[PDB]
Amino acid sequence: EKRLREKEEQKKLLEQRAQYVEKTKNILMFT
Amino acid sequence: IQRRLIKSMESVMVKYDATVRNSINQVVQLRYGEDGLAGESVEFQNLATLK
Amino acid sequence: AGILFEDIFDVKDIDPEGKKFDRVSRLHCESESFKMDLILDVNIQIYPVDLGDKFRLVIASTLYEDGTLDDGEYNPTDDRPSRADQFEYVMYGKVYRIEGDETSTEAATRLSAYVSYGGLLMRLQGDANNLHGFEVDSRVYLLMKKLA
Amino acid sequence: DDEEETYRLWKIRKTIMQLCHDRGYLVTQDELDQTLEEFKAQFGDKPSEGRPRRTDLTVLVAHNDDPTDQMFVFFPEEPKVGIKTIKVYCQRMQEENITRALIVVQQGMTPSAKQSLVDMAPKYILEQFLQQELLINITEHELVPEHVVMTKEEVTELLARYKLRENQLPRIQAGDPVARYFGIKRGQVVKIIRPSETAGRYITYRLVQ
Amino acid sequence: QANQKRITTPYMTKYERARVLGTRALQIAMCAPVMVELEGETDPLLIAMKELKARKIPIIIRRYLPDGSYEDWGVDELIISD
Amino acid sequence: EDREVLRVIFPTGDSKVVLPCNLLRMIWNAQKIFHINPRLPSDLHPIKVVEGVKELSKKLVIVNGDDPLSRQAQENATLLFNIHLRSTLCSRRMAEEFRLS
Amino acid sequence: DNKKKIIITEDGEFKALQEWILETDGVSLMRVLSEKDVDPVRTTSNDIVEIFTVLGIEAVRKALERELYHVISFDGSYVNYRHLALLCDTMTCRGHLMAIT
Numbered sequence: 001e002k003r004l005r006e007k008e009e010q011k012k013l014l015e016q017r018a019q020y021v022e023k024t025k026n027i028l029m030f031t
Numbered sequence: 032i033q034r035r036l037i038k039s040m041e042s043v044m045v046k047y048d049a050t051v052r053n054s055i056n057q058v059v060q061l062r063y064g065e066d067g068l069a070g071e072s073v074e075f076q077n078l079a080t081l082k
Numbered sequence: 083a084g085i086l087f088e089d090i091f092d093v094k095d096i097d098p099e100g101k102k103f104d105r106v107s108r109l110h111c112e113s114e115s116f117k118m119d120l121i122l123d124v125n126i127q128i129y130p131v132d133l134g135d136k137f138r139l140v141i142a143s144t145l146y147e148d149g150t151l152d153d154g155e156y157n158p159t160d161d162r163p164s165r166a167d168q169f170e171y172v173m174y175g176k177v178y179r180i181e182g183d184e185t186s187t188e189a190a191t192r193l194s195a196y197v198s199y200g201g202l203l204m205r206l207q208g209d210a211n212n213l214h215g216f217e218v219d220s221r222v223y224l225l226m227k228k229l230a
Numbered sequence: 231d232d233e234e235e236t237y238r239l240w241k242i243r244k245t246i247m248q249l250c251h252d253r254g255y256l257v258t259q260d261e262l263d264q265t266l267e268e269f270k271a272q273f274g275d276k277p278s279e280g281r282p283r284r285t286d287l288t289v290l291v292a293h294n295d296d297p298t299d300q301m302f303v304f305f306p307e308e309p310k311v312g313i314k315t316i317k318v319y320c321q322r323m324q325e326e327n328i329t330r331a332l333i334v335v336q337q338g339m340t341p342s343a344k345q346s347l348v349d350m351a352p353k354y355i356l357e358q359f360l361q362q363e364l365l366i367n368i369t370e371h372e373l374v375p376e377h378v379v380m381t382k383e384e385v386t387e388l389l390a391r392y393k394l395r396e397n398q399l400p401r402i403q404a405g406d407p408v409a410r411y412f413g414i415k416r417g418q419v420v421k422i423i424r425p426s427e428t429a430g431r432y433i434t435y436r437l438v439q
Numbered sequence: 440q441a442n443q444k445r446i447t448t449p450y451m452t453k454y455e456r457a458r459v460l461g462t463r464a465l466q467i468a469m470c471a472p473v474m475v476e477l478e479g480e481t482d483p484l485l486i487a488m489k490e491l492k493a494r495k496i497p498i499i500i501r502r503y504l505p506d507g508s509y510e511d512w513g514v515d516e517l518i519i520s521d
Numbered sequence: 522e523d524r525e526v527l528r529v530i531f532p533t534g535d536s537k538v539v540l541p542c543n544l545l546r547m548i549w550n551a552q553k554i555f556h557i558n559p560r561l562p563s564d565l566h567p568i569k570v571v572e573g574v575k576e577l578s579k580k581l582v583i584v585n586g587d588d589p590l591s592r593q594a595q596e597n598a599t600l601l602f603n604i605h606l607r608s609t610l611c612s613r614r615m616a617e618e619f620r621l622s
Numbered sequence: 623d624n625k626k627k628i629i630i631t632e633d634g635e636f637k638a639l640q641e642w643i644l645e646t647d648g649v650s651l652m653r654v655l656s657e658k659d660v661d662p663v664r665t666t667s668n669d670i671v672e673i674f675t676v677l678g679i680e681a682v683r684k685a686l687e688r689e690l691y692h693v694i695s696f697d698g699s700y701v702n703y704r705h706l707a708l709l710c711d712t713m714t715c716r717g718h719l720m721a722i723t
Contacts, residue, residue, distance in 0.1 A: 009259070012256065012258075013258050013259075013260075015256070015297075016256050016257075016258055016292070019256075019292050019297060020290075023290040023300075023326075026290070026322075026325070026326040027288055027290065029325070030285075030288070030322045030325075030326075031285050035722045035723065036709070036722055039712060039722045040708065040709065040712050043708065043712065046504070046505045047447045047448075047502045047503065047504055047505075047510070048392070048393070048446065048447070048504055048505055048506075049448075049583070049584070050392065050505065051708065051711075052398075052505055053712075055398075056394075056398055056505055057397070057398050057399075057400070057715065058392070058394065058398050058399055058400060058715075059400070059708065059711045059712060059715050060434075060707070060708065060711055061392070061433075061434065061594065062429070062583060062584065062594075062598055063704060063708075064428050064429075064702075064703065064704025064707060064708075065426040065428050065429040065432040065598070065704075065707065066426070066428045066429035066583060066598050066599070066601075066602075066704075067583040067584070067598055068428070068541055068583075068704075070702040070704055070705070072541055073428075073539045073540060073541050073702070074539065074540070074541075074543055075537060075538070075539055076537075076538055076539070076540050076543060076544070076545070076605060077536045077537060077538070078527055078531075078536040078538055078604070078605055078608065079536070079605075079608045079609060079614075080523065080524045080527065080604070080608040081524070081527045081528070081531060081534060081535075081536040082534050082536050082635075082636060180559075180560065182560075186617070217558070218558070218559070219553070219556065237658070241656075362652065362653070362656065363652070363676075365655075365656035366655045366656050366662040367662075368676070368677050368678070368681075370662065370663050371662065371663055371677055371681060372663055372664055372666070373666060373673065373677055373680075373681035373682075373684045373685050374677055374678065374680065374681045375680050375684070377680070387588075387590060388590065391586070391588060391590045391591065393504070393505075393506040394505065394506065398505075400711075400714075400715040400716065400717070401715070401716050401717030402678070402679055402680075402717045403679070403717045403718060406678045406679055406717070407675075407676060407677055407678040407681075408677070408678040408679075408680070408681075409678070422680050424680065424684070425529065425530040426530075426597075426601075427530070427531075427538070427539075427601075427703055428539065428601065428703055428704065428707075429597055429598050429599070429600060429601055430526065430530055430597065430599075430600025430601035430602075430604065431530075431596070431597035431600050432597060433593070433594065433597060436679070436680075436717065439717055446585055446586075528630060532628060533623065533624070533628045533636070534628060534636030539702070539703070
């Protein structure tokens with residue numbers, strides 16, 4: 001169960017990566 | 032100081048739903064003393080599993 | 083009989099810590115027949131006790147020579163044969179503690195019965211074989227007599 | 231002059247990440263506990279010359295419940311932030327379609343800028359923070375109990391259980407340090423859980439004003 | 440308010456006891472019928488306390504709640520401690 | 522678990538607390554009322570101690586209600602007392618310390 | 623021990639660490655907290671107004687309870703905590719510091 005929860009942590013981490021790769025272009029055209 | 036304290040807290044009362052409220056009916060404490068117990072019956076004791 | 087304990091004690095010390103009360107004195111005594119230590123508070127004003135004295139101590143559950151319980155009430159107009167007639171100093175108290183060297187698994191080899199005679203305290207400690215008659219919150223008598 | 235500047239930037243970023251995590255925004259554990267040396271590696275250790283510039287410190291997080299509910303954290307360069315800078319940030323938020331932001335100012339913010347932050351609230355909920363008050367996370371203080379923003383369902387359940395109106399709960403100011411930390415507006419109730427020496431635990435509820 | 444579910448305490452408060460005893464003692468003093476038997480009592484307070492111990496005081500306590508509702512408890516329905 | 526809860530409630534090791542019922546005095550009262558012999562084995566089942574303490578805890582109500590919010594407030598209102606009660610009326614203490622029947 | 627650092631050893635005992643502490647004659651809690659090697663968790667003040675301005679209404683509630691308790695108990699006296707709690711709730715139930723004036 002702890003392994004599943006850490007895997008959910010990893011999937012959330014890659015989800016934040018998958019949205020950060022969108023957010024960097026907005027930060028780029030910001031300045 | 033005594034008069035000031037009294038006039039500040041005079042109407043705070045334990046209600047029949049056991050909440051402590053003032054005259055405006057605003058809630059000051061959801062239970063008296065956070066435990067809903069009167070101060071005459073409580074007494075000093077020791078928690079045996081703390082130390 | 084109604085006797086919980088009987089032995090002859092020898093006063094080995096009086097007030098090691100110093101005289102605490104004027105009319106009361108603490109005796110630290112030891113017997114010979116059972117090897118039991120005794121701390122006893124006695125009214126030395128009416129029954130003086132000197133160092134090195136030797137006395138017979140009898141802890142009893144009752145004063146009546148026949149097995150008969152007591153009511154704990156003062157009856158001076160009692161004509162029954164009482165064993166207090168055979169002793170000089172008699173007190174009446176209650177057992178308020180029984181200590182021992184018992185462990186969680188082993189029983190007690192040595193016991194220590196504590197008695198209070200209206201505030202005059204006694205501790206009789208020694209082998210647990212000699213202190214089976216003692217039970218806490220139980221009334222007893224002292225029945226102590228000096229001998230030469 | 232410079233090592234302390236990057237230390238302050240790292241501390242501010244740490245408090246901001248903790249703040250976003252407590253508001254419920256998606257924050258990875260790695261950036262949640264980022265060592266000062268890791269911060270220097272990722273941003274630099276010479277902010278004075280321009281590595282890192284505060285514009286590189288900008289954060290953009292997404293809410294756990296809604297990926298579209300994102301939030302910005304801007305770090306203006308000027309000590310006293312002016313209305314023009316607020317307009318620039320609002321323009322950027324419009325372009326990127328983001329509706330919430332934090333502005334971590336250094337010295338302060340002009341009255342016109344604050345009035346701009348207040349008037350356009352229904353469009354963009356953008357807050358103002360001093361870098362001085364982000365150098366510490368006040369929620370870690372021993373005096374500060376555990377605050378929890380209740381949901382409208384929870385608030386309705388509370389008022390129905392104790393059978394009372396919102397004006398009968400105790401209050402917390404909208405400008406409270408912890409209310410500002412949790413970014414809560416008027417009408418919201420915050421559940422405070424604190425230890426009690428007479429009961430063990432005590433939950434009280436404060437309405438935001 | 441649903442009488443099937445009364446949320447207030449099942450105990451009579453010290454103030455409820457005080458006022459109920461005073462009220463019933465005044466009622467007895469004003470020649471109200473007594474609900475319990477009497478050996479020789481002539482003081483209304485003693486008669487009222489005897490009625491309370493017997494749980495035979497014909498009074499209903501209307502306890503008001505902060506929301507405005509109320510709960511009606513018979514003196515025989517409450518737990519008398521003192 | 523109660524120990525850790527107390528450790529976070531009282532970060533300084535001060536076990537002096539103010540609570541309703543003096544449980545040690547009540548235990549002493551029970552020892553003297555029923556003439557408990559501390560030297561003899563007891564006839565109290567430790568499972569009876571556990572079950573009785575749980576039912577007692579259920580009967581001590583400061584906040585009335587079956588709803589989850591009332592349940593949590595009830596938990597909080599009597600938390601410290603219930604910890605004191607579970608640590609005082611423990612099965613082991615009731616077996617080798619108090620030796621009640 | 624009220625100002626020492628009370629920790630819990632790995633064995634589970636309460637241990638009072640004897641550590642350096644600073645007492646200032648003025649208050650800048652806002653600044654002192656944000657200093658390197660300064661504990662931002664236990665560092666406090668006796669100026670309740672600054673506690674309210676820096677930490678908030680519940681922090682000043684707790685601090686005000688602490689300060690009133692310190693004033694009451696310094697002469698060895700003792701007052702039931704519910705009275706201090708009621709006074710402190712009266713001064714803080716409306717989101718601001720309500721003086722008794």
